[PDB]
Write a protein that binds this DNA or RNA. Structure first.
Ligand SMILES: [Mg+2]
Ligand SMILES: [Mg+2]
Ligand SMILES: [Mg+2]
Ligand SMILES: [Mg+2]
Ligand SMILES: [Mg+2]
Ligand SMILES: [Mg+2]
Ligand SMILES: [Mg+2]
Ligand SMILES: [Mg+2]
Ligand SMILES: [Mg+2]
Ligand SMILES: [Mg+2]
Ligand SMILES: [Mg+2]
Ligand SMILES: [Mg+2]
Ligand SMILES: [Mg+2]
Ligand SMILES: [Mg+2]
Ligand SMILES: [Mg+2]
Ligand SMILES: [Mg+2]
Ligand SMILES: [Mg+2]
Ligand SMILES: [Mg+2]
Ligand SMILES: [Mg+2]
Ligand SMILES: [Mg+2]
Ligand SMILES: [Mg+2]
Ligand SMILES: [Mg+2]
Ligand SMILES: [Mg+2]
Ligand SMILES: [Mg+2]
Ligand SMILES: [Mg+2]
Ligand SMILES: [Mg+2]
Ligand SMILES: [Mg+2]
Ligand SMILES: [Mg+2]
Ligand SMILES: [Mg+2]
Ligand SMILES: [Mg+2]
Ligand SMILES: [Mg+2]
Ligand SMILES: [Mg+2]
Ligand SMILES: [Mg+2]
Ligand SMILES: [Mg+2]
Ligand SMILES: [Mg+2]
Lengths: 154, 114, 68
RNA sequence: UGGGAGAGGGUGGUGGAAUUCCCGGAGUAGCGGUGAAAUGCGCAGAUACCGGGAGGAACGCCGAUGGCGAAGGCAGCCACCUGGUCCACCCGUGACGCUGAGGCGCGAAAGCGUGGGGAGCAAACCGGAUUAGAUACCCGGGUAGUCCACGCCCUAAACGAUGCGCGCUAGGUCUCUGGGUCUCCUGGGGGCCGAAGCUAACGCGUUAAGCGCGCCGCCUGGGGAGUACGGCCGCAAGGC
């Protein structure tokens, strides 16, 4: 907006752990207003996380989000007669938004039949070092690194 | 071999060329924006000049040199960056001098410069 | 902080007084404008002519490299 | 008679910065160029660096709303020859003045002739891009020419788009250059703001586009057209 800065929306902490990050992840999982279905998907994923890699599901979730978070990103910009991918920093809020969006998208790209297992498998994949979301983050950061010459064009 | 040398920085608007010379001006090694895999207008960026200066200084240390006097010619974009990269590469920078050649109203410039 | 101010009486046509005349040059060997010096326009003309004479004679420089 | 300032002009010399080329050294994987590139240049060793030599052209800082000249124009420094102009003294002559149809001289750049010179730049020309095309704008090259001597050409937004001379009509302010009783007054230039006045308005306004006198040049709707014809000038281009 031209006039002012947008005021961020304060989500309500979830009624199982009191964590707003869980609420944001559920909102990213949800579509068409089906909030109960999204919450059940997340909690089934949490149960499967409890079975395999029997550590705390919250710990695995937070580790996945921390692993997927990107520090650099390229933004397009036309100067003269050429378009340039200017590398720029990422604010922590956008870091969280990108991490959650990439996690959900990568989970939905997996070929497992049920969604509740897709989310859990993607979460424990991103927990250690792997997954589609980690690959996306590496691609983005590599693109930002391969454009350090244009860091003055911002 | 010598531990004291000279650093010439030639920073045009299209490229930055760095040469390390012995105290008699005979070059030991050199590096430019194209020596690192850059072509075109990217050779003129400050970051390319920083990389070229770091590469030339690294080769100079690989030869066993420790201090360089810096001479800067030209007013390109990568001038200050190359000078700073030399300052923080592992070489003692005793002095920096500006020596860009300017005529005392000599030859007629090209049309683009008129 | 003016070159004319911080000096005594001297000849403006003297082309051998290197110590006095060099005070009217910048760090790179360039003649100072009226702003830095403080002479009048005629005095500046005489100073410039004498400086060029001394440059030809080999005492004052034509240019010196800028040192940071 | 005594002094002043000045890129005013002509002739002869000579100082450094920088570009280019050649010689030698050292050294290697690109340089250059653009909006992005490509042509081009480079391992047959380029670019960047150091030393030596040659040559041509132009004079950075000072430097300016500065100065000089009738105009065109004039800029490193030194010497010589030479023009104009300003002030002070109030010395001499005694109206000897102003303007000026024709005439004569000068007159940027480009251009022309004969010799010389030629670094850089660069009409024409060649190539690369761009584009629908690109006989251009951008890039890489490139010949006249740009420079010197002599001789022609004689044009321009040759403009202050304001002919020259003389007298009269509030001031304020900035600046260059003289004289004095050097706070300040009194000459001569160059700018800005403004009395009265003028102007269609914009604006001008003691540097008039105000108030007057003298002499010269020019205008009489736009186009055709600065064309045609005639005449004169020029080697030609073309000029009047
Ligand atoms: Mg709104
Ligand atoms: Mg380039
Ligand atoms: Mg080759
Ligand atoms: Mg070589
Ligand atoms: Mg030659
Ligand atoms: Mg004249
Ligand atoms: Mg005269
Ligand atoms: Mg008398
Ligand atoms: Mg008598
Ligand atoms: Mg009369
Ligand atoms: Mg008559
Ligand atoms: Mg002429
Ligand atoms: Mg002219
Ligand atoms: Mg000519
Ligand atoms: Mg000729
Ligand atoms: Mg072409
Ligand atoms: Mg096309
Ligand atoms: Mg060209
Ligand atoms: Mg050329
Ligand atoms: Mg030629
Ligand atoms: Mg004129
Ligand atoms: Mg007229
Ligand atoms: Mg008139
Ligand atoms: Mg007349
Ligand atoms: Mg006056
Ligand atoms: Mg006045
Ligand atoms: Mg005015
Ligand atoms: Mg006025
Ligand atoms: Mg006036
Ligand atoms: Mg009138
Ligand atoms: Mg009529
Ligand atoms: Mg005619
Ligand atoms: Mg005829
Ligand atoms: Mg004829
Ligand atoms: Mg005509």
């Amino acid at each position: 907006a031209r006039r002012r800065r947008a005021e961020v929306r304060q989500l309500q902490p979830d009624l199982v752990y009191g964590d707003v990050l869980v609420t944001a992840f559920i909102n990213k999982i949800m579509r068409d207003g089906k909030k109960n279905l999204a919450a059940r998907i997340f909690y089934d994923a949490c149960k499967i996380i409890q079975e395999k890699t029997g550590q705390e599901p919250l710990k695995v979730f937070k580790q996945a989000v921390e692993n997927v978070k990107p520090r650099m990103e390229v933004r397009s910009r036309r100067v003269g007669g050429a378009n340039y991918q200017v590398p720029m920093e990422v604010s922590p809020r956008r870091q969280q938004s990108l991490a959650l969006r990439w996690l959900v998208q990568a989970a939905n790209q997996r070929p497992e039949r049920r969604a509740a297992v897709r989310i859990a498998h993607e979460l424990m994949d991103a927990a250690e070092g792997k997954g589609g979301a980690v690959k996306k983050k590496e691609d983005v950061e590599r693109m930002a690194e391969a454009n350090r010459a244009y860091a003055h064009y911002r | 071999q010598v531990a004291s040398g000279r650093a010439y920085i030639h920073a045009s608007y299209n490229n930055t060329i760095v040469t390390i010379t012995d105290p008699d001006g005979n070059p030991i090694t050199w590096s430019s924006g194209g020596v690192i895999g850059y072509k075109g207008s990217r050779k003129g960026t400050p970051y390319a000049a920083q990389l070229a200066a770091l590469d030339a200084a690294k080769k100079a240390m690989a030869y066993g040199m420790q201090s360089v006097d810096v001479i800067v010619r030209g007013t390109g974009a990568g001038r200050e960056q190359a000078i700073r990269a030399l300052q923080a590469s592992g070489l003692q920078v005793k002095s920096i001098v500006d020596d860009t050649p300017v005529p005392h109203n000599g030859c007629r410039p090209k049309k683009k410069f008129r | 902080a003016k070159v004319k101010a911080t000096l005594g009486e001297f000849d403006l046509r003297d082309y051998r007084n290197v110590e006095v005349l060099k005070r009217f040059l910048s760090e790179t060997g360039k003649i100072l404008p009226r702003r830095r010096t403080g002479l009048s326009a005629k005095e500046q003309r005489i100073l410039a002519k004498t400086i060029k004479r001394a440059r030809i004679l080999g005492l004052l420089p034509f240019t010196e490299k800028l040192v940071r």
